[PDB]
Structure formats: structure tokens, C-alpha cells
């Protein structure tokens, strides 16, 4: 203020900005065959848990 004589004037205020884009669309999609569900040695539920773990 002292170097500017003793003068002042109002500057315009402003913003900065960033955009959070909700732009990631990811999917899991698979078949459990009715024949294989009978013919395998045990449960196949583990593929649903593995699909959820991949996402």
C-alpha cells in the first residue's frame, strides 16, 4: 500500500476447479452350465466370490 503511493483498487475474485468424472463402468459376466454343476466334484459358488473379488 505504501509503494502504491497510498492508493488501492478492488481486484476481481476468481475460482479454480477440478471435475470428478463418474466415468468408470466395470462388469463381470459368466455362465455356470447346468450339466457342469451336476458333473463336477463339488460346489461352484466360489466363482461368484471370485467375481466379486475381481471387481
Amino acid at each position: 500500500y505504501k509503494a502504491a503511493g497510498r492508493q488501492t483498487s478492488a481486484d476481481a475474485i476468481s475460482d479454480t476447479g477440478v471435475d470428478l468424472l463418474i466415468d468408470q463402468e466395470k462388469s463381470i459376466d459368466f455362465l455356470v452350465d447346468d450339466i457342469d454343476r451336476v458333473q463336477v466334484a463339488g460346489s461352484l459358488e466360489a466363482y461368484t466370490r471370485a467375481g466379486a473379488t475381481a471387481l
Binding site: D34, I35, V38, Q39
Partner: protein, 54 residues
């Protein structure tokens, strides 16, 4: 064919029927699956007359 029942074997493993809607029309869809197998476990226990008959 002349045989003894013990000479040949059959397995029905799956036999199911299912009801759906058609994706491409206003229709019901009925579908059924049958899974099976069989073997002449003792070939000399089965005798065939006219074997090439077709």
C-alpha cells in the same frame, strides 16, 4: 436282438424341463434337457440278427 439284461447298461444323469419368455416375440418358451449314457458292458451277451439293417 437277443441278450441278458446284465450285458448292457444305461444311465439317465439329468432330465429337466424349463419355462421362459421369448426375447424376440410375445411367446412362451419351453425347453428340456436330457443327459444320459450307455454301454454294452459284455459284448458276447448280445446277439444281433440283421446287424447292417438300415
Amino acid at each position: 436282438v437277443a441278450f441278458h439284461p446284465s450285458a448292457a447298461a444305461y444311465v439317465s444323469q439329468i432330465d429337466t424341463v424349463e419355462a421362459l419368455r421369448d426375447q424376440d416375440s410375445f411367446s412362451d418358451r419351453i425347453r428340456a434337457l436330457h443327459v444320459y449314457g450307455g454301454k454294452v458292458v459284455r459284448p458276447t451277451g448280445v446277439v444281433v440278427f440283421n446287424k447292417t439293417g438300415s
